[PDB]
Design a protein around this nucleic acid. Structure first.
Ligand code: FES
Ligand code: K
Ligand code: MG
Ligand code: MG
Ligand code: MG
Ligand code: MG
Ligand code: MG
Ligand code: MG
Ligand code: MG
Ligand code: MG
Ligand code: MG
Lengths: 122, 97, 86, 100, 137, 58
RNA sequence: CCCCACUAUGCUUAGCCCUAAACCUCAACAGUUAAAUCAACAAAACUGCUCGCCAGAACACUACGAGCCACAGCUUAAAACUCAAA
């Protein structure tokens, strides 16, 4: 299916970041994935401190990899990212653009519930 | 029979159903700016739908996106990211007297 | 512990008015439910007891909001008697 | 050739008005209690409007005024009630006086 | 400019100053308001301890420590030792809902310190350790 | 414990107690009058008597 | 009952045990709101069809028999004596 890899990389110089991305995209292809696009979301301060591979991180490079892969590649890729020392945090989710949003007519009002109690005099 | 008798039909004056501010829009966990508009600035607590004004479907979408974004490294948990404090105030809550 | 400090639950004092800053902070923590949450967490509330409390609190909200809605609806009728003497 | 009730109802101004929310109507003050003006505007129920602060003395019994209607009858069903509670008055906003 | 209750964010260029010091440079008064005691420690922005006072160190014992006046006395004592070390403005970080939560802050002010901000850091577990069983009273 | 040296502080405490003594006398009057209250339970119950909730059919 | 300390235990894995006010004490499916609405209370009153279950209290979540990884257990489950009530 179509997946989205949300990849937070260690803050590095341009050469080491390109080597990490190439090494990560090749890992996807080695597992049978068809990589569709690579998006750079920019280097930013993390929302909190993240400890990864005996190091503390406060900034990271946010990248996205849109790709298709067999269902068995996800588990194998997650294991690969856990060993890459230049990856702070990597998560694979089902691509949000696959889920088609159903149409909505609006808010249907809810009337106050009726006949909850008998009408006998108490 | 008679021309002036009422005729059966649907209410012509019926108003269109109201929609939430996010009706028809995609809620992504990477759009931290939008998600930040539905958490407390001081505590990061997700606002209930009585504060956000969202429909049930979008209250769930926002909630699930926030929880995903927080643990994936996109959004803080204990406070609203200060970068997003000057965004439009869409929630119905006032903390200053 | 891993987050930045002096952002969460932080209120700045204006013109040395520490009372108003503390009241604002207490109002913030109260509205977000933290004060009541801290109190309920001092001793363990068993799940059966928590479910009963939530049911009681939800039924109280419905009753209180419906009584308030009726009070506001009838308040206009609190005007002086237009037909006094009849 | 006697007009039927169905005909009277179809061609009545109250029928032709449609929904009452945000409709401008002409009312007449028929009863006054202190600064509460009781105004009939052609509906089942009168509305009660407070005397405006400006030109309050111009509003007297018989004075015709302009109203913006909100509801012809204020009614609501409350928790546990079997029927709707009615206050037996219309909801309207007093705009001013009508003059020629 | 209008007043902002939100604290200045470190790394941005704010105009607020206190004795020529930025918000990130103001010392911190850590108040631990427990149910049976109140502890106050003033530290520098670099985490250097400057003064410590608690209801117990001010000569209160047993239930008297868990009072507002006991915390107020601890605040004055901590303020006095901190003022000698050059402290005027402090950032208050209070954790706990004890009786000396607010009184400890008053004592810091009566002792000559100016509170520029108040921070709550009461630990709230998001799901955490199981607390002790309820009391039968 | 010499009152001669603590005059200003004593006069403060004395005035503060007097203000709190009068304040209770003020509050009590305004509480019964309802000057600050949204409505008095007594007044708010006479209004409900006129529009009683009807959980039964008539 | 209140305070402190600490164990079995609450967790995981692999097997047992098979019990709860396991109760929303309101069976499944289909249907109705009219007639008589209806002991009381509770969560208005009923029809069709089917399975399960019940027939004074207590003895009795007991005895015996039988089955079961259960061996101070579980399930099924009586009788005698006693009472005019429960
Ligand atoms: S009202 Fe349409 S999605 Fe919310
Ligand atoms: K039950
Ligand atoms: Mg143990
Ligand atoms: Mg676990
Ligand atoms: Mg159960
Ligand atoms: Mg049963
Ligand atoms: Mg069955
Ligand atoms: Mg029997
Ligand atoms: Mg048993
Ligand atoms: Mg047995
Ligand atoms: Mg046996």
């Amino acid at each position: 299916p179509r997946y989205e890899l949300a990849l937070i990389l260690k803050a590095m110089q341009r050469p080491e970041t390109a080597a990490t991305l190439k090494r990560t995209i090749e890992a996807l292809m080695d597992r049978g994935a068809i990589v569709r696009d690579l998006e750079n979301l920019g280097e930013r301060a993390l929302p909190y401190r993240i400890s990864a591979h005996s190091q503390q991180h406060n900034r990271g490079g946010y990248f996205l990899v849109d790709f298709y892969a067999p269902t068995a590649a996800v588990e194998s890729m997650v294991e690969h990212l856990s060993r890459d020392i230049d990856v702070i945090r990597g998560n694979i989710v089902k691509h949000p653009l696959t889920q088609e949003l159903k149409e909505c007519e609006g808010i249907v009002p809810v009337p106050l519930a009726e006949k909850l109690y008998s009408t006998k005099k108490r | 029979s008679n021309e002036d008798l009422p005729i059966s039909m649907e209410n012509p004056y019926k108003e269109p159903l109201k929609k939430c501010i996010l009706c028809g829009k995609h809620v992504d966990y990477k759009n931290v700016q939008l998600l930040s508009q539905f958490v407390s600035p001081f505590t990061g607590c997700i606002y209930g739908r009585h504060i956000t004004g969202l429909c049930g479907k979008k209250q769930k979408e926002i909630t699930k996106a926030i929880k995903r974004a927080q643990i994936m490294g996109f959004m803080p948990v204990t406070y609203k990211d200060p970068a997003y404090l000057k965004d439009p105030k869409v929630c119905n809550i006032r903390y200053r007297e | 512990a891993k987050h930045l400090k002096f952002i969460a639950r932080t209120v700045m004092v204006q013109e040395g008015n520490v009372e108003s800053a503390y009241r604002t902070l207490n109002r913030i923590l109260t509205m977000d439910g933290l004060i009541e949450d801290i109190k309920h967490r001092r001793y363990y509330e068993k799940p059966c007891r928590r479910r009963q409390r939530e049911s009681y609190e939800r039924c109280r909200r419905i009753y209180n909001m419906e009584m308030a809605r009726k009070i506001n609806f009838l308040m206009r009728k609190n005007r002086a008697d237009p037909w006094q003497g009849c | 050739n006697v007009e039927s009730f169905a005909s009277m109802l179809r061609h009545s101004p109250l029928t032709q008005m449609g929904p009452a929310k945000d409709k401008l109507v002409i009312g007449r003050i028929f009863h006054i209690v202190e600064n509460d003006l009781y105004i009939d505007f052609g509906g089942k129920f009168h509305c009660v409007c407070r005397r405006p602060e400006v030109d309050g003395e111009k509003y007297q019994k018989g004075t015709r005024v302009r109203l913006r209607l909100l509801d012809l009858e204020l009614t609501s069903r409350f928790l546990g009630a079997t029927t709707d509670t009615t206050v037996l008055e219309a909801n309207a906003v007093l705009l001013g006086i009508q003059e020629s | 400019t209008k007043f902002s209750i939100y604290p200045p964010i470190p790394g941005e260029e704010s105009s607020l100053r206190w004795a020529g010091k930025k918000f990130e440079e103001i010392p911190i008064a850590h108040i631990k308001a427990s149910h049976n005691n109140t502890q106050i420690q003033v530290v520098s922005a670099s985490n250097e301890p400057l003064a410590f006072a608690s209801c117990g160190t001010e000569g209160f014992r047993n239930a008297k420590k868990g009072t507002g006046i006991a915390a107020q006395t601890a605040g004055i004592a901590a303020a006095a030792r901190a003022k000698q070390k050059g402290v005027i403005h402090i950032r208050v970080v209070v954790k706990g809902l004890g009786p000396g939560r607010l009184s400890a802050m008053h004592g810091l002010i009566m002792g000559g310190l100016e509170v520029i901000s108040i921070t709550d850091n009461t630990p709230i577990p998001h799901x955490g350790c199981r607390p002790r069983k309820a009391r039968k009273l | 414990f010499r009152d001669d040296a603590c005059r200003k502080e004593i006069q403060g405490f004395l005035d503060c107690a007097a203000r709190a003594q009068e304040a209770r006398k003020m509050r009590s009057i305004q509480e019964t009058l309802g000057e600050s209250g949204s409505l008095l339970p007594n007044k708010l119950n006479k209004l409900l008597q006129r529009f009683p909730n009807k959980p039964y059919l008539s």
